[PDB]
Amino acid sequence: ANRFTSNIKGLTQAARNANDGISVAQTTEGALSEINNNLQRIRELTVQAS
Amino acid sequence: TGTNSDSDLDSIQDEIKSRLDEIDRVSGQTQFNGVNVLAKDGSMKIQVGA
């Protein structure tokens, strides 16, 4: 029973960590998209200046 | 023609000179948004392909 409950608690904590990693990935994706917008604007401005 | 004398020819001559001066003026003073078009032999490139 002790082995069982240790494994169960570990699995719960691991699921929590996975959710946290998902949140980190979402934040990084938001930042990357924010940079992508400026990159596209620079692309258009360079096309205008060419 | 030969019916006009030198006194009659000077008028045609100075009219031609004034016309040539106007030609030079309009050739040297025409510009589009700050860049001239009749002063240099350089070519212009228009980015039309993205």
UniProtKB/Swiss-Prot annotation, chain B:
Record localization: Secreted; Bacterial flagellum
Disulfide bridge map: none
TM segment ranges: none
Family of this protein: Belongs to the bacterial flagellin family.
Main function: Flagellin is the subunit protein which polymerizes to form the filaments of bacterial flagella.
Protein known as: Flagellin
Species whose genome carries this gene: Escherichia coli O127:H6 (strain E2348/69 / EPEC)
Gene name of the record: fliC
Residue window of the full protein shown: 101 to 150 of 548
